[PDB]
Symmetry: C2
Subunit: 389 residues, 2 copies
């Protein structure tokens, strides 16, 4: 209940710390199923410096707004596009929703001209798509053509091509690093289909965008295509600094091929900004720029390939103990086949091991973020073996 | 451009500080038109403690999730509802969008049963509504019936009542503290109309919700109704800690009358959370709870009525200098009539005074947040007099 009298700073901080003590902490070897991790320590100072900024009012924070533009330019350069137009937004969800808004407004323009027989935008989406695409469908009344996945759990490119011939398609979604298994759709083929048919293509690289460009060749697999960025001519890319960019939440990224896409993000206010949010942090842009500058490609390569080394270690231990990984890992994600995954996950949770559950297959998914070290993997294998005894 | 080699912490921090130096700062007497201000200093420690939490994964942060529930309960108690269901979200925009989603899904349920002749939800919205309502309309394909405002710039209640008889209405929006003038719609009458016709009513108290409950009686005006909360039976209320709650961005609030509204926030994921965002900060809930506890009603009353004292001072000086305020202030907002407001605003901006421009009237709007002190108001009056000479 709200009280008349205030309390002391010592009282309220001690209470909050008690609540914090009930949380898990990334560095304690409990969290195995999350795509967030410890932030780069430098970002704590940056959050402090930029706490009292608001990119919803950029005319008041000219320098913080410039840092957002510079963060976007660095991400754009990483993705092979020196002219990208974009924003440092609240996360991959808002990023994906903005792309969907752009796809919808391109369709709206067509409908206004009689150039579309679709009463709602028709968008081809793989069934591996993150839940944010369902939030967008539900809110924006989109019509999704769900694309099946092949045996390697990547989108069926022939289905997409056939569907594009069969229907009037307003967008195609490809995923560069799926949530459950870390697989990479064949963006190169999808972008060829999209370009040939003049269809908008969005790449969801929320997770993979800050991993794929840094992978050592020994982790790359023959036959797997790792191309996903603006070198393929795609229209937009979601990329999430607060996942494998080690930035504090909220630090999401949305990049469009060029500034011509901005007009399709406009909103008509008859009695009255491209982001969905209004008031919004300025420290995400500052952190995204600073972390990429501080690390350079070299520093991020080191972190990414350390994670991959621990990922292949876990893969190795899993097989050595007769567990069946769903696939040989593509990114720093491994999943364990198990018909009894629901209950094994709950048994793991009761022993202090928190994994996530897949949807496209009966399995436990582990995300080997930088906080997962070899000793945590050893401890995980012991606890799981025991659960199975 | 992205570089191979990293840089030192000293290099990147000094660069960021240079960019920060180009920003305005709330405490420097430049910012007059914003509803954000300096955060309560205790929140810097809280942000640090809770930086590495994620309410998108509450199973991993049980204590931070409890603090969100406690923050919501304190806001609910402030709004006369000990059973409110809600969330500490990214801001008033996401809060308003979630309410609109709820209104739409109530309508969808009716449509599924043949109980609605509306092909889209029809929502009565005053023309003073914040831009976030237009974002919701554009994204969710809502049909708005724009309600006119009366001479006191509050919604025309008779129009709403007539419109509700004339049409099948799926929602009503009332504003408790408008963006441009700080006026309070007659929520009591609107809630009576809504209850009698079984129409969902949402109250946008993003700004007013943390001001109105704390106003000293000398600032209240005869004939103005200050009732706006769940004591009126309304369905939902937006309230923004990162405005007059002195909390860091992102700290927005959405409260529903009870937990029965949660099901209308569900999203059907055939191949797979009530917030729009996924990954999201945990420090907003911690800060909202802590600031309300630390201040108590007493501490917030002091800040609110200090602002009102400075608001009426500015009002007094304005008239003393023959400027025409749009209205006698209701909340800590005053606006200055001026046919030449566009250019006067730009002249003010070139002299370091940043105000905002109204849409419903030709005027400059000043928000007297806690960072505005008597000497800033004196300086503002001198600069404006000079601009007029």
């Amino acid at each position: 209940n709200m009280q008349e009298k205030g309390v002391s700073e010592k009282e309220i901080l001690e209470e909050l710390k008690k609540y914090r003590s009930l949380d898990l902490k990334y560095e304690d070897g409990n969290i195995f199923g999350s795509m967030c991790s410890n932030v780069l320590p430098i970002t704590r100072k940056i959050v402090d410096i930029f706490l009292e900024t608001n990119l919803g009012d950029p005319g008041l924070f000219k320098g913080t707004k410039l840092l957002e533009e510079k963060a976007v330019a660095l991400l754009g350069s990483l993705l092979n596009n020196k002219d990208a137009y974009g924003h440092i937004v609240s996360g991959g969800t808002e990023a994906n929703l903005m792309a969907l808004r752009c796809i919808k407004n391109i369709w709206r323009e067509k409908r206004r001209k009689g150039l579309s027989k679709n009463e709602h935008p028709k968008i081809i989406v793989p069934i591996t798509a993150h839940f944010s695409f369902e939030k967008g469908r539900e809110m924006m009344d989109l019509e999704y053509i769900y694309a099946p996945i092949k045996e390697d759990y990547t989108i069926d490119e022939k289905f997409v091509k056939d569907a594009v011939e069969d229907y009037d398609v307003d967008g195609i979604i490809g995923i560069a690093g799926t949530t459950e298994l870390g697989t990479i759709d064949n963006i190169e083929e999808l972008s060829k289909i999209a370009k040939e048919n003049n269809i908008y293509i969005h790449v969801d690289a929320a997770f993979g965008g800050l991993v794929i460009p840094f992978l050592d060749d020994k982790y790359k697999k023959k036959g797997v295509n790792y191309k996903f960025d603006f070198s393929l001519g795609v229209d937009s890319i979601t990329i999430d600094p607060h996942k494998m960019g080690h930035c504090p939440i909220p630090s999401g990224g949305i990049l469009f091929k060029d500034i011509g896409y901005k007009r399709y993000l406009d909103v008509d206010a008859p009695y009255l900004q491209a982001t969905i949010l209004g008031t919004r942090v300025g420290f995400g842009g500052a952190c995204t720029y600073a972390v990429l500058r501080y690390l350079g490609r070299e520093g991020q390569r080191k972190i990414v390939n350390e994670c991959m080394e621990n990922t292949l270690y876990l893969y190795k231990k899993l097989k050595e103990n007769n567990f069946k990984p769903v696939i040989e890992p593509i990114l720093n994600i491994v999943a364990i086949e198990d018909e009894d995954y629901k209950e094994v996950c709950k048994k793991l949770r009761d022993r202090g091991i928190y994994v996530s559950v897949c949807n496209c297959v009966k399995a436990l998914a582990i995300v080997v973020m930088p906080h997962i070290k070899r000793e945590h993997i050893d401890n995980f294998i012991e606890i799981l073996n025991s659960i199975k005894r």
